[PDB]
Design a protein around this nucleic acid. Structure first.
Lengths: 271, 100, 88, 65, 116, 65
RNA sequence: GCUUGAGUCUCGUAGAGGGGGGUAGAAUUCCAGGUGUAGCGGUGAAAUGCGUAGAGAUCUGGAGGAAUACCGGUGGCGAAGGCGGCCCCCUGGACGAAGACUGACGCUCAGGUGCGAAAGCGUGGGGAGCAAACAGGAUUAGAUACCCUGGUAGUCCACGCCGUAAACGAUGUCGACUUGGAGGUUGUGCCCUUGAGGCGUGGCUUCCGGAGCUAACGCGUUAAGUCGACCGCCUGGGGAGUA
RNA sequence: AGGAGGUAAAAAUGUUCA
C-alpha cells in the first residue's frame, strides 16, 4: 500500500512509501546468496562508460531461478522476501524434495500457495510451462526468448506480456512496450503478472533518496562549457543548437534500432 | 446443492472422442456427490452462424445437480480446452429429465 | 442471507419454543446473525451502496429493538448483550 | 432480406424492405445521439396516440356528413 | 478477359452518391460506375436518375467479361437503391435474386450529432 | 388475438427451437407482443430464451450469415 | 396487560435493484494482401481534406476499444441520483398466501452521518467512435457561431475528491376518511379447464373525470379534497444568492 | 383503417415623449 508521510521535515514532506506488511523481516537464505561488488559505471579499461552510477548502499545478490528446470515436482511458497537488486519482490520456494529456490513473485501470491512447473502443470499464477500449452490471450511474465535460455521479457514489477496469436511454431507476444514479437512456442513462461505493482507509485522525496539507490547527479548540457558538451557555451543561458547527446548524436527523436538479424521476429514496432 | 443445465458444443474432429469427455466429467462430479439428471446428447447438428469457422458442431447437454465448488473447476476446464467451443451454464428451477 | 435451517437454530435458541419466533430477544439475535454474516460481503466489494442501505436499515432496527428491551426489562437486556458480544 | 421468387417475377416486389427495417433504423443512427430526447418523443408518441383513440371513442357528436 | 459467367452486383446507394460495382462470385471486382463519374455533379448527384446512368455505364465496361446472370446486393438508404436495379435489369442482365445488406449496428458506436 | 401457455400452464424452453422460431421473424428478429398477442410476462421469458438460443447458435443473430 | 400500529418466522412471485469476474454478435476505425479504376467525401452550393505513391467500392484474415439493435411498451425495479445482450457467484428490498408469534418497540426529526446525473479534479491505465479547445475551408457587412473536413482534454477502467442540476409529478414525510370509468402490470382465492375464461380479494401504476378545492390553469382516493403529527422554508423588484 | 422514406443558404436596425 501507499502511505504519504507527514511533512515534519523538508525532504520527508514529499516522500511516498510503498510498504508491504507481509515481507519476511529476517535475514535472507544464505545458500542462495553471493556477493555483488559495485562498478561505478566503469569497465575493463577503468573508464566511466555509463554515467550517473556510483555510491549507494551495499547489496547482496540473490540467485533468482529464472530458468525453472524442476519439472513434475510440486513446490510450496515458504515466504516472500525483499530483493534490493530487483524492482519486484522474490518468493522463497521450497520443493517437495527439500530444495529451496528463489523465484520471482507473481501478483496473487501468499505464503502457502502451491505451484509447480513442467508441461504437466495446470493454469494458475506461478506455474511455469511451455507457451504451446498456454491458451491464446493469457497473461504471462518472465518469458524465455530461446528454449532453455532463462527468461528475459516481463520480469520487472507489475509487468506482463500477452499472447495474441499462436500461428504454427511461433507464438506472437505483445510486449509491455506495445510491441508485437514472434517467439518460438517451446520457450517457457510463468502465468500472471509480476508482484509489487505499487512500485510505480513510489516517490523518493529526497535528493539523497536517489543517492543510495546508486544514482549520481546529472548535470545538464546547457550548464556546461563548449569543450564539455555539444550544447555548452552561452553568456547568459543561450541554447540555439539542436538537442544532441554528449557525443553529437541527435537525440530527442532519432531511431537507433539496427539489428537486422532480429528484424525477422518483430511484427509491429513500438509506437 | 444447486441444479445446472451445462451445455457445450464440441469440435467436429474430436466428436469421435466425445464419449470420453462425457464420462470423464461425470467422474469428477459424482466423486463430489454430484447426482446427475440428464445426458441428452443431440449429436453433431448444423450451426446457425460460423463459430470460429467450421460449421456443424457437436452438441452435448448434461443437466447436472451439484454444489458450486464442483462446477467451478468444470468451467475452467472448458476455458482451457480447445475441443469444447462456447459452453454455458444456467440456474436450477427444478432440473428436468425430458424434452429432446 | 440466513436460509431456513440457519435461522431455525436461532429461533429455538432464544425463544421459549420453536413456535415462538416473534419475541424481541429472538429478533435482535436474528438481525445480529445477519449483520455479522454480511461483514464478509462488505469486507470486499466495498462499493455495494444499495445493499449497504439494507444493512444499515437492520442495524437501526436492532438499535430500536435493543432500546425497547432495555426500557421494558433491563434484566433480560443485561443477559442478551454479553451473550452476543456487543454494546460498546 | 433475400427476395427471389425464382422464375415468374420480372419485377422487384420487395415488400419486405418497406416492412422490416431498411429505412427506419438506418435513418435513425444517421446522426443525433440525444441520450435523452428518445424519452420525450417516447411519451409524446403515445400522448398523441392515446388522445386520438380517446376522441375515436368520442367522434359521435353529429358533424352532419 | 478470362470470361466469367456468373457475378454479383454491389450497389452502394448512400445519401450523396450511388457507386455501383459489379464483381464476380468470389468478390473480385471487374468493373464499376458511379453517378458522379457520368457527370451529374452537385444536387443532381444524389438523384435516382443519376443512379440510372450509373447502372447503364456499369452495364457496359464489363462486356469483355460477358456476365450472363447476376445477383444484386444493395447497401445503404440512398435515393436510388430501387431505380438502379431497374436499369440494370432492363439493360439485358438476368436477375436471379435481390438481397439487402445494409450494415445496421447493434449500438456499436456513437453516431454524429451534426446538422442543426 | 392468439394466446399461449397463460391458460395451458407450462414454461418456455430455450432448447425447444420448434416453437421458438414461430415467435421470431425469419430475418432473425424478435417479433413484438402487439402483433403476436403474447402476454407481457411470457414475452420476457421468450426473449431470454431467444437470446440464449442465439448464443448456442440454435437461432440466427441475423439471416445474413 | 390486550390487538386493528409496527416488526419477526414458514412457502413462493416478478423484476435494466446493487457489486465482482468471464463471454457473444452486428457495426465503426485501423493494419496486411488480392481484384480493380477515376474519382471519393461533403453540402443549399462549394471548398479544405482523401486519390494515379493508386483511394473509394469489393473480398479474405487479423488487432483493438466502446455501446448493447430486434425484444422495448405513459412496462419494470430503486430512497433519490439512476439502472437494460447473455452467463455465473456474493447480496438488498418490495408484494401476495393461510396461520402462529412479540406486544406500542410507532410517526417526524434541528444539529450529525451517508448516498447523490453530468461536467470538473488528483494517480495510474486505455483510447475505436464521438468531441470542448484549436486549425483550416466556407457562409457573411463582420462570423474568433450555426454548416463542412480534421481534431486535444474528455467520454471508458481502478482507487480517492467534488456535493452541484429545470437533482421536476416544479407538489416534504406518515396516518385516517371522502361518488366512478377505462387500461397496463404483478400475486392469489373461488366456480365447470365445462373453449382465446367468469366473479371477487391485494400491491404498483397510466389516462379521463364528480363533489370539493383553487386566482385561474387545473388537482381530483398515487389530491392541490376533508383533518391530525412533525420538519424545512418565504415576507415587494433590483442590489444578490453577491460582498 | 395501420406504420415509414422525402419537404426551406441567407434577411441586422427603428430617438425620447403622447
Amino acid at each position: 500500500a501507499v502511505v504519504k508521510c507527514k511533512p515534519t521535515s523538508p525532504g520527508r514532506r514529499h516522500v511516498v512509501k510503498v510498504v508491504n506488511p507481509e515481507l519476511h523481516k529476517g535475514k535472507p537464505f544464505a545458500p542462495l546468496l553471493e556477493k555483488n561488488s559495485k562498478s561505478g559505471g566503469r569497465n575493463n579499461n577503468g573508464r566511466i562508460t555509463t554515467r550517473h552510477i556510483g555510491g549507494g548502499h551495499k547489496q547482496a545478490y540473490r540467485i533468482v531461478d529464472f530458468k525453472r528446470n524442476k519439472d513434475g515436482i510440486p513446490a510450496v511458497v515458504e515466504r516472500l522476501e525483499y530483493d534490493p537488486n530487483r524492482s519486484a519482490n522474490i518468493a522463497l520456494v521450497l520443493y517437495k524434495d527439500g530444495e529451496r529456490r528463489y523465484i520471482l513473485a507473481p501478483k496473487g501470491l501468499k505464503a502457502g500457495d502451491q505451484i509447480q512447473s513442467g508441461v504437466d502443470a495446470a493454469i494458475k499464477p506461478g506455474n511455469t510451462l511451455p507457451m504451446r500449452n498456454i491458451p491464446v490471450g493469457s497473461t504471462v511474465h518472465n518469458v524465455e526468448m530461446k528454449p532453455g535460455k532463462g527468461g528475459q521479457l516481463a520480469r520487472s514489477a507489475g509487468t506482463y506480456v500477452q499472447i495474441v496469436a499462436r500461428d504454427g511454431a511461433y507464438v506472437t507476444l505483445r510486449l509491455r512496450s506495445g510491441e508485437m514479437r514472434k517467439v518460438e512456442a517451446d520457450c517457457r513462461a510463468t502465468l500472471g503478472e509480476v508482484g509489487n505493482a505499487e512500485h510505480m507509485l513510489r516517490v523518493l522525496g529526497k535528493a539523497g533518496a536517489a543517492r543510495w539507490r546508486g544514482v549520481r547527479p546529472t548535470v545538464r548540457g546547457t550548464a556546461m562549457n563548449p569543450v564539455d558538451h555539444p550544447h555548452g557555451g552561452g553568456e547568459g543561458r543561450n541554447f540555439g543548437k539542436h538537442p544532441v547527446t554528449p557525443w553529437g548524436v541527435q537525440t530527442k527523436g532519432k531511431k537507433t534500432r539496427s539489428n537486422k538479424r532480429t528484424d525477422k521476429f518483430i511484427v509491429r514496432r513500438r509506437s | 446443492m444447486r441444479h445446472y443445465e451445462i451445455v457445450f458444443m464440441v469440435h467436429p474432429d474430436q466428436s469421435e472422442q466425445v464419449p470420453g469427455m462425457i464420462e470423464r466429467y461425470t467422474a469428477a462430479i459424482t466423486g463430489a456427490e454430484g447426482k446427475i439428471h440428464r445426458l441428452e446428447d443431440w449429436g453433431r447438428r448444423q450451426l446457425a452462424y460460423p463459430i470460429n469457422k467450421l460449421h456443424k458442431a457437436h452438441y452435448v447437454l448434461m443437466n447436472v445437480e451439484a454444489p458450486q465448488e464442483v462446477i467451478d473447476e468444470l468451467e475452467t476446464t472448458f476455458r482451457f480446452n480447445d475441443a469444447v467451443i462456447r459452453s454455458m451454464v444456467m440456474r436450477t428451477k427444478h432440473a428436468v429429465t425430458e424434452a429432446s | 442471507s440466513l436460509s431456513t435451517e440457519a435461522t431455525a437454530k436461532i429461533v429455538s435458541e432464544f425463544g421459549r419454543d420453536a413456535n415462538d419466533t416473534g419475541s424481541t430477544e429472538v429478533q435482535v439475535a436474528l438481525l445480529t446473525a445477519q449483520i455479522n454474516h454480511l461483514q464478509g460481503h462488505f469486507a470486499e466489494h466495498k462499493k455495494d451502496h444499495h445493499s449497504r442501505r439494507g444493512l444499515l436499515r437492520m442495524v437501526s432496527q436492532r438499535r430500536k429493538l435493543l432500546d425497547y428491551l432495555k426500557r421494558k426489562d433491563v434484566a433480560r437486556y443485561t443477559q442478551l448483550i454479553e451473550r452476543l458480544g456487543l454494546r460498546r | 432480406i433475400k427476395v427471389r421468387e425464382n422464375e415468374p417475377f420480372d419485377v422487384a416486389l420487395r415488400r419486405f424492405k418497406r416492412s422490416c427495417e431498411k429505412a427506419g433504423v438506418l435513418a435513425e443512427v444517421r446522426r443525433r445521439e440525444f441520450y435523452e430526447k428518445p424519452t420525450t418523443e417516447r411519451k409524446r408518441a403515445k400522448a398523441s396516440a392515446v388522445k386520438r383513440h380517446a376522441k375515436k371513442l368520442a367522434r359521435e357528436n353529429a358533424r352532419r356528413t | 478477359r478470362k470470361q466469367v459467367s456468373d457475378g454479383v452486383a454491389h450497389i452502394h446507394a448512400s445519401f450523396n452518391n450511388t457507386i455501383v460495382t459489379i464483381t464476380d462470385r468470389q468478390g473480385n471486382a471487374l468493373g464499376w460506375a458511379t453517378a458522379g463519374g457520368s457527370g451529374f455533379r452537385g444536387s443532381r448527384k444524389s438523384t435516382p436518375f443519376a443512379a440510372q446512368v450509373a447502372a447503364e455505364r456499369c452495364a457496359d465496361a464489363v462486356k469483355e467479361y460477358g456476365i450472363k446472370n447476376l445477383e444484386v446486393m444493395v447497401k445503404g438508404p440512398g435515393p436510388g437503391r430501387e431505380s438502379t436495379i431497374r436499369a440494370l435489369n432492363a439493360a439485358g442482365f438476368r436477375i436471379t435474386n435481390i438481397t439487402d445488406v445494409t450494415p445496421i449496428p447493434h449500438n456499436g458506436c456513437r453516431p454524429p450529432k451534426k446538422r442543426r | 388475438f392468439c394466446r399461449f401457455t397463460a391458460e395451458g400452464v407450462q414454461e418456455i424452453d430455450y432448447k425447444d427451437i420448434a416453437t421458438l422460431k414461430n415467435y421470431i421473424t425469419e430475418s432473425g428478429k424478435i417479433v413484438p407482443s402487439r402483433i403476436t398477442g403474447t402476454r407481457a410476462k411470457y414475452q420476457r421469458q421468450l426473449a431470454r430464451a431467444i437470446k440464449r438460443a442465439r448464443y448456442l447458435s440454435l437461432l440466427p443473430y441475423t439471416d445474413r450469415h
